[PDB]
RNA sequence: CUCGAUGUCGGCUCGUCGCAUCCUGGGGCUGGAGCAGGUCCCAAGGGUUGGGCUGUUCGCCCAUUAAAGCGGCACGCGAGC
RNA sequence: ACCGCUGAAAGCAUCUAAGCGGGAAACCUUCUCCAAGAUCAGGUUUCUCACCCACUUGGUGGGAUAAGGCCCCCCGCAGA
């Protein structure tokens, strides 16, 4: 079903096609993507994005619903940029900005610094709460998955870095 | 994981999927991770 | 920025430092050198610098080798060797005719010293590879220093390539790593290098700065 | 087979076309014309190609 | 008396084969026949007939995705445990001319005259060859229709 | 297969190879609080001690060790002892 | 091995089918050594850079030399 549904475009000032290619630009930075070769991307009446396919294969149905939710991440990620929201639990654990970087005090014998790459901006809101922002959904969630594995998963005291709202498993201990 | 040539779901929320050419069981309870090898 | 010099080993002696410990040094005359040729990557394919060393009579050097010095404007020397640099920024500090001396090394720096090890002749297996031999008694017939077995049986019907055996030993290029520089004497042109330096007392020695530090 | 393929036909179909036209030249002399007289070998290709059936894959 | 060629009758020429999308099996076969002279009607298996082959663009040959990972190249040095192995995918980065040249030299006959045949083969990686003093004519792959 | 000869245990000497891994290296699960473990998966680069008893292999014992691995190679190796 | 992010076929979900990461004494570079007999026999330089004779006038035979090396001589911590 996904892929058989158009892409709503709020602004999309240069949603273009140049020989099996696509680009986007708007209030934020620009983003590029190349759809796989059987899947054609085309226009609706509103200048929007509607993708097509040859019909009923094992491999063309897969690349169609895939390549819908990759093009729509561009026109969402430029208008409404993605922010992952993470929290710090445990007694004595905290987080600060050393400039553009992000230090952690996770019970180690050294402060763990995380060098922020291009396109990613860190921001804290509390000593136990912070956010990771950007425009690319894969590039944001890759950085937020590096921070989640900074400590070993601890099922006894809950000491670690988490996503907000998620519920890790807990054991009884002694 | 458990590495046994016979894998099957144990509880009612174990999915049974296929990745990288081998059949494995993922779940929420971590003692139900199984694969074939 | 790997510096290097050619020199002559002069023997060993001992010296005392500030903590009143004894330090076995090995005197190396890091003599005056000169460049005579620069290997550039666009002309020769790599980056290096020749170094000429040693006093010699100008009649003992033949006409093919004399003319290689006339193209550089240097009197003929005895030895001639290359210092291998990295693959970029070749000769911004080496010119043809530049005099290199012994005080390019600082006190307390580390050096890597390469020369030719002393010869030991046709050496048996207990000296060359450190075997054990059979016993000295308890019946051992004529095998007191012999290597024993050298293979299996009908499988495999061959001695493997690389089996350790008797043969000549010495005359090998041996590099000794991370030697401490106790004192450089700029008045005499002498490095006091802590430890052992391979060679007979008078052989050629290349003293290069360490990479392992 | 080397000289049939300078005249865009396989050896597979040259022997078929020279039996469908009644040319009983043996392979010794057919390989001696190919070296010594090449214009007399193109004519034996055009005899064997024209005498070949039109759909060579259709059953007889 | 069938024809056996004299010395001084084998006339050689210069071909150049581009390899921009050609698989390694189609190109090693068409270079092996062209070096030995199977395409010439004056063929004799004991005479080094055949032309020169210049293979340009060997870093762009068509090898599948599952062969740049799992197809191995073995050498043995003679010393025990001296078996080494490198994948095709880590030979197509350093020495891409050796991958095309190994596929040709396994398709020549295993005899003495193939060591003179393989002296007529130049394999390069880029699109540029030094043999412009000669005039190499290009050679495209053709299949005779049947 | 070998009877017009293929010299057999154990030890010494020198090896080489497999991984069904003893130590060290990387992990999942745990009836894993920690420290130590149990179990499974990945991994063969190097290391794997010296004595008492016995012809011994094996095995028990002593003092250690990061550990004192299991096997193939004519139960490797007597034109080497 | 194991852990992932994005993400369908399968409106959910899933480390995967397109695509991208983290990952060990194993592998490959790095460090030491041998190595162009690597017959694809390599590279940058320097020196000599020259005569005479006969014949069946040949990528022919000889002779005499340059640059240069070897033998002999004095030896070595180099060595059967
Ligand atoms: Mg994997
Ligand atoms: Mg001696
Ligand atoms: Mg002894
Ligand atoms: Mg005797
Ligand atoms: Mg004796
Ligand atoms: Mg055969
Ligand atoms: Mg007999
Ligand atoms: Mg464990
Ligand atoms: Mg294993
Ligand atoms: Mg071992
Ligand atoms: Mg290694
Ligand atoms: Mg006693
Ligand atoms: Mg063994
Ligand atoms: Mg035995
Ligand atoms: Mg045994
Ligand atoms: Mg015995
Ligand atoms: Mg024997
Ligand atoms: Mg590493
Ligand atoms: Mg060398
Ligand atoms: Mg070789
Ligand atoms: Mg040479
Ligand atoms: Zn379960």
From Swiss-Prot, chain A:
- Coiled coil regions, renumbered to chain: none
List the GO cellular component terms. cytosolic large ribosomal subunit; peptidoglycan-based cell wall; plasma membrane
Q: What InterPro entries does UniProt report for this protein, alphabetically?
A: Ribosomal_uL6-like, Ribosomal_uL6-like_a/b-dom_sf, Ribosomal_uL6_a/b-dom, Ribosomal_uL6_bac-type, Ribosomal_uL6_CS
Cross-referenced NCBIfam families, in alphabetical order? L6_bact
Q: Which PROSITE patterns match?
A: RIBOSOMAL_L6_1
Q: What is this protein called?
A: Large ribosomal subunit protein uL6
The reply to whether Signal figures as a keyword in the UniProt entry is no
Q: Which keywords fit this entry according to its UniProt record?
A: Ribonucleoprotein, Ribosomal protein, RNA-binding, rRNA-binding
| Any one GO BP annotation for this protein | cytoplasmic translation
Q: What HAMAP family does its record include?
A: Ribosomal_uL6_B
How the protein assembles, per its UniProt entry? Part of the 50S ribosomal subunit.
A molecular function (GO) term = rRNA binding
Record keywords: RNA-binding included?
yes
Q: Family, per the entry?
A: Belongs to the universal ribosomal protein uL6 family.
The record's section on SUPFAM superfamilies has: Ribosomal protein L6
Q: What is the annotated role of this protein in its UniProt record?
A: This protein binds to the 23S rRNA, and is important in its secondary structure. It is located near the subunit interface in the base of the L7/L12 stalk, and near the tRNA binding site of the peptidyltransferase center.
Curated annotation (Swiss-Prot), chain B:
What stretches pass through the bilayer? none
A Pfam family cross-referenced in the UniProt record is Ribosomal_L36
Q: Can you name one GO molecular function term for this protein?
A: structural constituent of ribosome
The UniProt entry's GO CC annotations, sorted and at most eight, read:
cytoplasm; ribonucleoprotein complex; ribosome
Highest taxon above the source species:
Bacteria
The GO annotation for biological process reads: translation
Q: Does the keyword Ribosomal protein apply?
A: yes
What's in the keyword line of the UniProt record? Answer: Ribonucleoprotein, Ribosomal protein
Q: Which family does it belong to?
A: Belongs to the bacterial ribosomal protein bL36 family.
Q: Which NCBIfam families match?
A: rpmJ_bact (TIGR01022)
PANTHER family reported for this sequence: 50S RIBOSOMAL PROTEIN L36, CHLOROPLASTIC (PTHR42888), LARGE RIBOSOMAL SUBUNIT PROTEIN BL36C (PTHR42888:SF1)
Which protein is depicted?
A: Large ribosomal subunit protein bL36
Recorded source organism is: Mycobacterium tuberculosis (strain ATCC 25618 / H37Rv)
UniProtKB/Swiss-Prot annotation, chain C:
Q: Which Pfam families match?
A: Ribosomal_L3
This protein's GO CC annotations:
cytosol; cytosolic large ribosomal subunit; plasma membrane
UniProt keyword Phosphoprotein, yes or no: no
- Alphabetized InterPro entries for the sequence: Ribosomal_uL3, Ribosomal_uL3_bac/org-type, Ribosomal_uL3_CS, Transl_B-barrel_sf
This chain's function reads: One of the primary rRNA binding proteins, it binds directly near the 3'-end of the 23S rRNA, where it nucleates assembly of the 50S subunit.
PANTHER family, A to Z: 50S RIBOSOMAL PROTEIN L3, LARGE RIBOSOMAL SUBUNIT PROTEIN UL3C
Q: Which family does the similarity line name? A: Belongs to the universal ribosomal protein uL3 family.
Q: This chain belongs to which protein, by name?
A: Large ribosomal subunit protein uL3
What is this protein's gene name?
A: rplC
Swiss-Prot record, chain D:
- The source's domain of life comes to Bacteria
Annotated GO biological processes are:
ribosomal large subunit assembly; translation
CC terms in the record's Gene Ontology section: cytosolic large ribosomal subunit; plasma membrane
Q: Which UniProt keywords apply?
A: Ribonucleoprotein, Ribosomal protein, RNA-binding, rRNA-binding
The terms under GO molecular function for this entry are: rRNA binding; structural constituent of ribosome
| Annotated function | Binds directly to 23S ribosomal RNA and is necessary for the in vitro assembly process of the 50S ribosomal subunit. It is not involved in the protein synthesizing functions of that subunit.
Which family, according to the similarity comment?
Belongs to the bacterial ribosomal protein bL20 family.
Q: What is this protein called?
A: Large ribosomal subunit protein bL20
Please tell me the species this chain comes from. Mycobacterium tuberculosis (strain ATCC 25618 / H37Rv)
Q: Which gene encodes it?
A: rplT
Q: Which residues of the full protein are shown?
A: 66 to 125 of 129
């Amino acid at each position: 079903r996904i892929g058989k549904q158009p892409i709503p475009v709020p602004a999309g000032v240069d949603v273009t096609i140049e020989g099996q290619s696509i680009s986007v630009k708007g209030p934020k930075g620009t983003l590029g993507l190349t759809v796989a070769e059987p899947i054609k991307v085309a226009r609706n009446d509103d200048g929007a994005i509607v993708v097509t396919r040859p019909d009923d294969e094992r491999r063309n149905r897969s690349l169609h619903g895939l390549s819908r939710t990759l093009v729509s991440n561009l026109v969402t990620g430029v208008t409404q940029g993605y922010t992952t929201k993470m929290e710090i639990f445990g007694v004595g654990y905290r987080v600060q900005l050393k400039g553009s970087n992000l230090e952690f005090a996770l019970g180690y014998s050294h402060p763990v610094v995380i060098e922020a790459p291009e396109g990613i901006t860190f921001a804290v809101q509390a000593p136990t709460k912070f956010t990771v922002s950007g425009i690319d959904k894969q590039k944001v969630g890759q950085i937020a998955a590096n921070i989640r594995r900074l400590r070993r998963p601890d099922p006894y005291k809950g000491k670690g870095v988490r996503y907000e709202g998620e519920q890790i498993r807990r054991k009884v201990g002694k | 994981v458990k590495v046994n040539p016979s894998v099957k779901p144990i509880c009612d929320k174990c999915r049974l999927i296929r990745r990288h050419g081998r059949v494995m069981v993922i779940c929420s309870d971590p003692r139900h991770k199984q694969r074939q090898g | 920025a790997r510096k290097g010099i050619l020199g002559t080993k002069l023997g060993m002696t001992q010296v005392f430092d500030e903590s009143n410990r004894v330090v076995p040094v090995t005197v190396v005359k890091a003599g005056p050198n000169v460049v005579t040729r620069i290997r550039t990557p666009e002309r020769d394919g790599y980056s290096a610098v020749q170094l000429a060393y040693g006093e010699i009579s100008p009649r003992k050097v033949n006409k093919p080798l004399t003319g290689q010095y006339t193209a550089a404007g240097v009197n003929p020397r005895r030895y001639l060797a290359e210092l291998r640099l990295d693959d970029s920024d070749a000769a911004t500090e080496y010119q043809v005719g530049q005099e290199l001396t012994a005080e390019i090394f600082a006190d307390g720096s580390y050096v890597d010293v390469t020369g030719t090890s002393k010869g030991k002749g046709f050496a048996g297996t207990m000296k060359r590879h450190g075997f054990r031999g059979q016993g000295a008694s308890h019946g051992a017939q004529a095998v007191h220093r012999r290597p024993g077995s050298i293979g299996g049986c009908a499988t495999p019907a061959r001695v493997f390539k690389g089996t350790r055996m008797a043969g000549r030993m010495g005359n090998d290029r041996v590099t000794v790593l991370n030697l401490l520089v106790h004192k450089v004497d700029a008045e005499n042109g002498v490095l006091l290098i802590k430890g052992a330096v391979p060679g007979r007392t008078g052989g050629l020695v290349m003293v290069r700065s360490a990479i392992k530090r | 087979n080397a000289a049939a393929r300078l005249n865009d036909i396989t050896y597979n179909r040259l022997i078929q076309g020279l039996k469908a036209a009644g040319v009983e030249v043996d392979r010794k002399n057919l390989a001696d014309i190919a070296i010594s007289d090449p214009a007399a070998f193109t004519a034996l290709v055009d005899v064997a190609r024209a005498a070949l059936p039109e759909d060579v894959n259709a059953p007889s | 008396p069938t024809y056996a060629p004299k010395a001084g009758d084998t006339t050689r020429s210069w071909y150049v084969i581009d390899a921009t999308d050609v698989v390694l099996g189609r190109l090693a076969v068409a270079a092996a026949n062209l070096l030995r002279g199977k395409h010439k009607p004056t063929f004799a298996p004991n005479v080094d007939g055949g032309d020169f082959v210049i293979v340009i663009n060997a870093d762009k040959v068509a090898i599948s995705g599952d062969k740049l990972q799992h197809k191995m190249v073995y050498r043995h040095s003679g010393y025990p445990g001296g078996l080494h192995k490198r994948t095709i995918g880590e030979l197509m980065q350093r020495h891409p001319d050796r991958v095309v040249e190994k596929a040709i030299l396994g398709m020549l006959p295993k005899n003495r005259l193939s060591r003179q045949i393989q002296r007529k083969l130049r394999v390069y990686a880029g699109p540029e060859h030094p043999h412009s003093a000669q005039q190499p004519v290009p050679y495209e792959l053709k299949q005779v229709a049947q």
